[PDB]
Amino acid sequence: PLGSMAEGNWCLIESDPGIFTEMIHGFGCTGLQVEELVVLDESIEHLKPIHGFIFLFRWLKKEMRKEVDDSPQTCTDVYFSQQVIQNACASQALINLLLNCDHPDVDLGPTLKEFKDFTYDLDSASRGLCLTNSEKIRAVHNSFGQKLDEEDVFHFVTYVPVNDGVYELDGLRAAPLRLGTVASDGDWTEVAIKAIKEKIKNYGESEVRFNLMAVISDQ
Template sequence: MSENAEGTWCLIESDPGVFTELIREFGCKGLQVEELWSLEEDDFNRLKPVHGLIFLFKWIGPSTSGTSEGSVVEDSRLEKIFFPRQVINNACASFAIISTLMNLDHPDVELGKVLSEFKDFTKSFDPAMKGLALSNSETIRSVHNSFARQTLFEFEEKSASKDDDVYHFVSFLPINGRLYELDGLRDGPVDHGAISDGKDWTNLVRTVLQERINRYNEGEIHFNLMAIVSDRKTQAERKLADLEAIGQATPDKVLELKQILVEEEAKRSRFKLENIRRKHNYLPLIVQFLKELAQQKQLLPLYEKAKEKSQSRVKKQPAS
């Protein structure tokens, strides 16, 4: 079995279930992660309050970022914004999530012991040192790595990441009335300007993201957007209690909130199930499965069929 050598970070999947559990296992309470499928205003409103966004996209190199939009913060704001430079590969999901969590200031959010202590400890560090400290934090790394798919076939993943597309995570969030982008490959936080008075910050970020996506459109860029939102179950419970306290818990309202509770509970158990499946070592099951197929004389037919499929796939592909 290949173990994770000291200091290595595994690739993890970009998935709301993984991110939600990742945040909980860092010890942070009151949040969950939802995937956004569009930049429509309604989709954002449905998830309110949205505390931050994690944006995953194909990384084409430093030359593509930084053109025209936003400016890198170099002034005293740096003392207030938690920003780590990303100094290692594969950790960008955790870097983006942690960068967001560390900068949240909302009554729904409880950062937890591990992250608060880390934030305190690195307070006076510059971005590079913060990044180094983060990548050396054993607690944070072990939580991150526990969400990797079983590392049994690690070499396969490694060779894939060399040829294939490289993905990168950045986060967007409002800090003191301005929209910032935290990208661990930049020198500092990127300032995308002031959020108009009385407007939700998500209006501004939707414009910024839309421009960026438009820029990529031609080259069929893959991207994926996750929202860090308040724990929806707690929120619904609180609303229900509030309505009851003031005697306004009408049957309609109660039904609506109870429905959210049921949905969220179902979602939680689904996330748990998926994560247990994700972390499982499947080699014994694969081996026994192959043996069972042989017992039932289905193994070689399955192989022949798979071989046919792969050959027809090869034929269809133009030579490269």
């Protein structure tokens, strides 16, 4: 119902790390870049600190039956905007990632900072409509540019650590999915990579249409 107030069309975005880097900059944020993982468990020590992953996959209806957490931290700790329109997923995934950063290498810039400040206390669905109707964000998105029911749509989601938890931010959902607790001396990326491998098991061994990117400190 909220989609009825969504204004303008959004283009699809190619899963290219150069493009996601330029989108971060176009939104006004500095200090970060995006690097592609060529193999899922390739060595990534030289990438660290990794601030989040962006994972693309062909969306399957069985995603609807995913069991999610009822942890209190999902409510208290995590910024999340739900999509109101389908084609915004690349920007929605990226902004869900960035608005959960607090790190000395990250500067969101005044546009995303004020956007976060405005939407931080709104319901996730309203946060999403606000994103969708932002002419600044939509402009940047489109400058770089389909029925779920038929399972031929490629979807972007985000993986990010917040406090002691690691979260999958999938903008089709009403809330983040808390995947598990990391550490105190653990590696948050292992929890995300595990979840990504679990999703890959939803398919046959002959599905190869995936892309994985890491958002890292600029180098």
